[PDB]
Amino acid sequence: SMWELTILHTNDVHSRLEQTSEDSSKCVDASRCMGGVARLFTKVQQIRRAEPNVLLLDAGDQYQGTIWFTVYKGAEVAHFMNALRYDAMALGNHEFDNGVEGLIEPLLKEAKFPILSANIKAKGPLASQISGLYLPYKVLPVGDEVVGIVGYTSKETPFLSNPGTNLVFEDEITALQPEVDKLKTLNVNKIIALGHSGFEMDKLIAQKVRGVDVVVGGHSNTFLYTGNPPSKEVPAGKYPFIVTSDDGRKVPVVQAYAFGKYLGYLKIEFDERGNVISSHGNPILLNSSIPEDPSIKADINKWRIKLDDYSTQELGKTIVYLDGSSQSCRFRECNMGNLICDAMINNNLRHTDEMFWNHVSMCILNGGGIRSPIDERNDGTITWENLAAVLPFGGTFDLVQLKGSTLKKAFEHSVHRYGQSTGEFLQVGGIHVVYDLSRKPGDRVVKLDVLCTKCRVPSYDPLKMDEVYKVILPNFLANGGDGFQMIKDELLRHDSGDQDINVVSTYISKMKVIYPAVEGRIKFS
Ligand SMILES: COC[C@](CO)(OC[C@H]1O[C@@H](n2ncc3c(NC4CCCC4)nc(Cl)nc32)[C@H](O)[C@@H]1O)P(=O)(O)O
Ligand SMILES: [Ca+2]
Ligand SMILES: [Zn+2]
Ligand SMILES: [Zn+2]
Incomplete structure (x- = not known):
């Protein structure tokens, strides 16, 4: 039986x-x-x-x-x-x-x-x-x-x-x-x-x-x-x-x-x-x-x-599909990742002195922290609820100071077990990185250029190992999350930051119509 x-x-x-x-x-x-x-x-x-x-x-x-x-x-x-x-x-x-x-x-x-x-x-x-x-x-x-x-x-x-x-x-x-x-x-x-x-x-x-x-x-x-x-x-x-x-x-x-x-x-x-x-x-x-x-x-x-208290009102328009899918954002450059990093950098614009165009140019964002796409086919409307699905954790985007060596190690960690759809894959702003996935874990980052801070015209130069860079990233990563223990342990400074959804909301409202592209921020040889 x-x-x-x-x-x-x-x-x-x-x-x-x-x-x-x-x-x-x-x-x-x-x-x-x-x-x-x-x-x-x-x-x-x-x-x-x-x-x-x-x-x-x-x-x-x-x-x-x-x-x-x-x-x-x-x-x-x-x-x-x-x-x-x-x-x-x-x-x-x-x-x-x-x-x-x-x-x-x-x-x-x-x-x-x-x-x-x-x-x-x-x-x-x-x-x-x-x-x-x-x-x-x-x-x-x-x-x-x-x-x-x-x-x-x-x-x-x-x-x-x-x-x-x-x-x-x-x-x-x-x-x-x-x-x-x-x-x-x-x-x-x-x-x-x-x-x-x-x-x-x-x-x-x-x-x-x-x-x-x-x-x-x-x-x-x-x-x-x-x-x-x-x-x-x-x-x-x-x-x-x-x-x-x-x-x-x-x-x-x-x-x-x-x-x-x-x-x-x-x-x-x-x-x-x-x-x-x-x-x-x-x-x-x-x-x-x-x-x-x-x-x-x-x-x-x-x-x-209780949830209808959240504002219906349009934050802004998108004329592109905001690809916040895991299949994109954990494996390669995704335009949702670019948007969020550009929003993060825009939030930290404080043009104080003649030497620096701005004191922070650089952004890293764990791809697994991008939790939803946003579809453009309802009149391009982005609401707070749509953004809440992208960024659900109630986190902050914080400024840290990292040595170049610390950053290099983070980008090695980004692809250390690539192929498994894990969240540590880094979306970026003001960083151009090139990986070679044929190479051994810990030795896959072949090019790593960063946007200059101490300059009047922003341009990309190779990352120096002992130079200290100001970087905007999630508090999750500042506290060693996603196995980024090198960040928590080696960081020279860590400031409190603004609420994650609000940062991106502010940027979309300022920009009004958005069309973030995949621009070759992250390449694979
Ligand atoms: C193999 O994939 C598993 C999974 C698939 O969807 O994704 C894992 C990825 O999710 C990201 N993640 N997890 C937590 C967290 C966070 N805040 C924390 C501290 C307080 C509040 C939780 N903040 C930010 Cl920005 N991302 C965060 C991170 O990338 C992680 O790998 P699953 O959801 O099943 O675990
Ligand atoms: Ca049995
Ligand atoms: Zn899950
Ligand atoms: Zn899980």
Whole structure:
């Protein structure tokens, strides 16, 4: 006899509580709009009516992405995940963005479902206040059977977030294996690994961790599809991706892109000993054909009223597509990156003396900090809400003083593991950089010219290693984020800076009509 489990899954929803446009920015024309929690509820309930054994899972990164999270700070996540009746959630890196206190009080205390992470260990005074609010695993009854769900979270979280000194992030495979063994001793033969470390780590967990039957993932925003994909997203593999484990088993691995646009849907046929016989399915595109649930929509509309206080009024126009996509901004020069850096430099114009045209000419911006495009095809209108999707973190753009050697090392770090779609890839202003990706990590920056400061005519000259340059960058990078530890450790000065969205808003308002280009700021030999 066979037992079929239906795994429903989301990952990297990123405050997209409402429905969105095709590129996950604000919904304009509702006929061509997608996702949101109300539409998700409808599809989940169809499948719960139709299929006997159903789990709705989240693989982290609900926190952070839109004005919803700016205002409600995770209370919206707790409320609407409770309304959808999620069966479990794994902690992502962005769940620690407002500290451990910003995780506990909004999300963990208000959640009426298990929140999971096995590789996070509390220390000192936190252990008491946090104990039981997150777990390493959960055994869940599904029909007659039980299904174990073991949690995991990225080891990189302290480089990406504010977990603080009282949490330790263990290796995933090291931490997961004891907990999966413990589930075997409790007669749990069906074990799902739900977590937030990326597709490559998902494949490694599937390969190495004995007992794990399915891996449900996030963080890398991985779209997988079997057959013709139903929208703009390009699949990185078949759904599910089959990893062959070290003990001979076929382990399906799944991810459901991002932004609540798709609902993941995998049907696993298990045998009586909890071995995967087969598995099939695809991520279901949550298009306008699927209606929003009236009661959830009405409740979204209630929480929406506070957000309509944000000004409707046009900040300015764009006549170009502002390419703030990850596929551009983490791999090459993107025009959204140029815009933001030009805005940053424009903000710091203080023409004080005859020697310098301006004291700062230079900008670096982590590409992973650019979180949305802005589409030009609604009369070119840019609103604050559109910019809030690009820059959702409530950060500042700060001035630092760096040695050229420190800057060189940052640009080496920018491409040290190029190809993985990680956020450390640097968008720039007043810097022309050339990479050679054939060369070894730490030796890929072949040309690095910078715009002169001590000059009346701005022009590009080679970066000198022992010269000190003033650079505008995000506070995230000033505090050593994205593994830019050389910046925090070697910086000579660090001033407080202006709020990130306001800087870019001011520039767009001053310029009125914008048309930023890709100009060869970043080249590859
Ligand atoms: C493998 O990609 C993972 C991911 C994909 O979308 O992107 C990671 C990239 O996101 C950027 N990031 N993360 C945090 C942060 C931040 N502020 C922090 C401190 C306080 C508030 C959080 N500020 C700025 Cl400007 N960027 C920030 C950074 O580039 C990082 O690699 P995911 O969102 O799944 O983690
Ligand atoms: Ca099993
Ligand atoms: Zn994410
Ligand atoms: Zn993440």
